[PDB]
């Protein structure tokens, strides 16, 4: 998720090598945007990384 | 002083109170990370029935009761509404906190 | 010492909120399914009256657990109600739409009336559905993908 206050772009990460990587384009709006990767599942731990 | 009393699913090895409850492997959580991959035979249980909030994001329910099991004092007659009367009787219940504490 | 439970008289009634018409009552046995489906709404309320006796000298035997549970086949939701033993030795149940709106959380659908009865001293844990009653009232998953709508070039 590419969020500013609310998500502008949500995409599925795709596996290559050993990493989930995706390439896309940045929307027209300027500001401070952050990437939230939040993986929450039934049984797994909660993953959360925001840059 | 309460117990998960069930009158349709009691094992033969009981004290005549039907306190022992045989829980089937159907009403489980159905997540292979918690309850393992294999197929399980019906399990045995003798304990106090708890309940959890339906709109609770953190709580889990590893093993609910059966369809007719109720939790109330085995000696006293039922006067109030019994706590966790149906399939919302919880037997095994887990929590995964915000710090990932199991 | 164990005992064998038995159900003697069961009356499925459809009472109308209006006084003028008399209620229509239909009787059924213990291992049976009622013919047709009853309806209960704002205009008509549901009523069931039953009596339980022992096989031998069944002087008003009262089981420890007697819960009337309605299972919704379409959505899976089920609701369990207690049984009230009036001093005439008659267990009675009255299903209202305005009065018991909160129990069903105001949801209209077709329910099945299962009756659970049996206790520590009874021999057989009865479970037979009386009839299909129609009641009508007045996070861990991927989210939806979003794509950005760019500005149209002139
Ligand atoms: C000055 O400061 C101000 C304060 O911050 C700034 O104001 C803020 O500005 C932003 C954006 O300008 C606003 O966000 C938007 O609000 C829109 C209308 O609001 C609805 O809000 C409710 C719905 O939102 C709820 O959603 C759930 C529901 O529970 C809930 O979890 C959530 O928290 C929230 O409560 C609703 O109740 C109201 O009635 C309103 O309908 C809303 O439509 C916007 O959503 C857009 O955009 C977001 C991200 O931008 C997307 O995630 C959405 O899916 C939706 O996306 C649409 O537009 C995108 C690009 O525009 C497309 O890429 C999408 O595909 C999608 O396109 C569809 O819709 C288009 C029509 O719009 C169609 O043309 C398309 O074909 C698609 O069908 C967004 O939420 C803030 O509300 C606002 N805040 C305040 C306080 O005013 C202000 O911007 C600052 N000034 C400047 C100059 O920047």
Euclidean distance between CA atoms C4 and B3, whole angstroms:
24
Ligand 1 binding site (Cβ under 6 Å of any ligand atom): A 6-8; C 146-149
Is residue C8 helix, strand or coil? strand
**Residue tagged 């709106």 (tokens):** C101
Report the distance separating Cα A35 and Cα A25, nearest Å: 13
Residues of A in contact with C152 (CB under 8 A): none
| Cα–Cα dist C27/C48, whole Å | 10
Chain breaks in chain C (C to N over 2.5 A) after: 138
CA C106 to chain centre: 15
Calpha distance B65→B63 (Å, rounded) = 7
Please name the helix (run of DSSP H) or strand (run of DSSP E) that holds residue B64, with its range, or none. Answer: strand B63-64
> Strand pairing of B3-5 and B63-64?
unpaired
- DSSP 8-state assignment for residue C64: S
On whether the CB atoms of residues C13 and C48 are closer than 8 A, the answer is yes
Cβ <8 Å between B78 and C65? yes
Contact predicate B61/B31, CB 8 Å: no
Question: Residue A2 and residue C81: Cα distance in Å, rounded?
Answer: 49
Neighbours of B39 (CB within 10 A): 6
H-type alpha helices, chain C: none
In chain C, DSSP finds a helix count (H) and a strand count (E) of: 0, 10
Q: Resolution in A for the shown PDB structure?
A: 3.5
Q: What share of chain B is helix, strand, coil (3-state, %, to 5)?
A: 5, 20, 75
| Structural contact between residues A10 and A22, judged by C-beta atoms closer than 8 angstroms | no
How many angstroms separate the CA atoms of C44 and A13, rounded?
57
Contact C118 B8 (CB under 8 A): yes
Sign of CA dihedral A9, A13, A16, A20: positive
- Is B102 at the interface with chain C, CB within 8 A? no
Could you tell me the two tokens for B10? 């009691």
Structure determination method: cryo-EM
């Amino acid at each position: 998720e590419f969020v500013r206050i609310d998500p502008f772009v949500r995409t599925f990460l795709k596996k290559k090598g050993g990493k989930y990587s995706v390439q896309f384009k940045l929307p027209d709006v300027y500001g401070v945007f952050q990437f939230k990767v939040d993986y929450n599942r039934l049984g797994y731990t909660h993953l959360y990384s925001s840059t | 002083k309460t117990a998960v009393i069930d009158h349709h699913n009691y094992d033969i090895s009981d004290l005549g109170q039907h306190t022992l409850i045989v829980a089937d492997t159907e009403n489980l959580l159905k997540a292979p990370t918690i309850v393992g991959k294999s197929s399980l035979n019906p399990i045995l249980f003798r304990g106090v029935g708890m309940v959890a909030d339906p709109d609770n994001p953190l709580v889990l329910d590893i093993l609910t009761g059966s369809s007719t099991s109720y939790s109330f004092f085995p000696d006293k007659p039922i006067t109030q509404y019994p706590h966790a009367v149906g399939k919302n009787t919880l037997l095994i219940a887990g929590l995964q906190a915000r710090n990932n504490a199991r | 010492i164990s005992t064998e439970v038995g159900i003697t008289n069961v009356d499925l009634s459809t009472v109308d909120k209006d006084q003028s018409i008399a209620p229509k009552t239909t009787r059924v046995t213990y291992p049976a399914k009622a013919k047709g489906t009853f309806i209960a709404d704002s205009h008509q309320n549901f009523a069931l009256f039953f009596q339980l006796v022992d096989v031998n000298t069944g002087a008003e035997l009262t089981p420890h657990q007697t819960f009337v549970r309605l299972h919704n086949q379409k959505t899976g939701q089920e609701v369990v109600f207690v049984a009230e033993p009036d001093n005439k030795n008659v267990y009675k149940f009255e299903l209202d739409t305005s009065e018991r709106k909160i129990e069903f959380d105001s949801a209209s659908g077709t329910y099945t009336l299962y009756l659970i009865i049996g206790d520590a001293t009874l021999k057989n844990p009865i479970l037979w559905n009386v009839a299909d009653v129609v009641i009508k009232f007045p996070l861990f998953t991927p989210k939806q993908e979003i794509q950005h709508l760019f500005r149209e070039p002139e």
